[PDB]
Write a structure and sequence with these properties.
The structure is a homotetramer. Chain A starts with a helix and ends with a helix. Chain A has one domain (1-91): Metal-sensitive repressor, helix protomer (Methane Monooxygenase Hydroxylase, Chain G, domain 1, Up-down Bundle). In chain A, helix 1 (2-29) runs antiparallel to helix 2 and helix 2 (34-70) runs antiparallel to helix 3. Chain A is built from three helices and no strands. By secondary structure, chain A is mostly helical. Helices cover 92% and strands 0% of the residues of chain A. The A-B interface holds A 7, 10-11, 14-15, 17-18, 21-22, 24-25, 28-29, 31, 34-35, 37-39, 41-42, 44-46, 48-49, 51-52, 55-56, 58-59, 63, 81-82, 85, 88-89, 91 and B 7, 10-11, 14-15, 17-18, 21-22, 24-25, 28-29, 31, 34-35, 37-39, 41-42, 44-46, 48-49, 51-52, 55-56, 58-59, 63, 81-82, 85, 88-89, 91. The PDB classes it as transcription.
Chain lengths: 91, 91, 91, 91
């Protein structure tokens, strides 16, 4: 249940993030001080970044590694794709 | 309805972000290719960043400006706080 | 010497960053392990971000505050500009 | 000269970044408007990020791939390291 382990934890992290977004809506609805709203926006963006890093790690480990066993063209295509994805996350 | 305008649009943006997070859960549930999941994580983090910038703009315009009219100590405290908040968003 | 204090420290921070970039060139010239090069790239990007936050703080405190005393149009223009600049730093 | 190609371009990019940092020092020395200084800070941080992505791509392609051919423990160690490095760049 290695897949099943990672999946259940991904879904738990995402459920937590989804509640944070509902929290933000409540904050706006109540006119909570903007700095406090920003603090929660940052906590949410950070939880998403942390989720992205776990996905990246699993991707590199399985997908990108498996391409190395197939050949050069395959690994180049996978690394090019992962690198574009990391570039998007960087912004 | 200037407050009411900004509020309604903040809530619309947040409702959109909340659906994106439910989208991510569906992607994980269906084992969508990880790069595609990352693309959506990045779109969500970016929508949150864009929301944060709008809040910051409104904060600077009203709160931080109003402190300038009160005095030096007041503006220093507000600018110190906004700058810490921006530092958190930067990460 | 409040201006003179901040100026001298800005220049010291920048001189330190400039040496870090020369360090990176030496690392590449010697074929240092790429992860170690990345660690130094990150330290440099972070020192630049930290410099950017100090500038932002001083800008908000003087420029953006002084605009509040002038009027609404003036503060809106200053806040719009600062917010675009922060958006650029965010990426 | 594939190594030699990448090396020469890495060094050219870094020489360009080093001049940008000297540019920043001139800006501060002349008391250039802070927003303009920020614009250059952002251009420099972005050039460094772009350099980091090229290094990452080359690292993944050679180092991380070569570890896949060695075995599981080797690839896990390499992916763990690359992922920590990407986490540092993300901030």
């Amino acid at each position: 249940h290695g897949y099943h382990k990672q999946k259940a934890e991904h879904l738990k992290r995402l459920r937590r993030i989804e509640g944070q977004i509902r929290g933000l809506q409540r904050m706006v609805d109540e006119d909570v001080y903007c700095i406090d709203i920003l603090t929660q926006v940052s906590a949410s963006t950070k939880a998403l970044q942390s989720f992205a890093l776990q996905l990246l790690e699993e991707h590199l480990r399985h997908c990108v590694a498996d391409a190395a066993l197939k050949g050069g063209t395959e690994i180049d295509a996978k690394v090019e794709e992962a690198t574009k994805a990391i570039g998007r996350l960087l912004r």
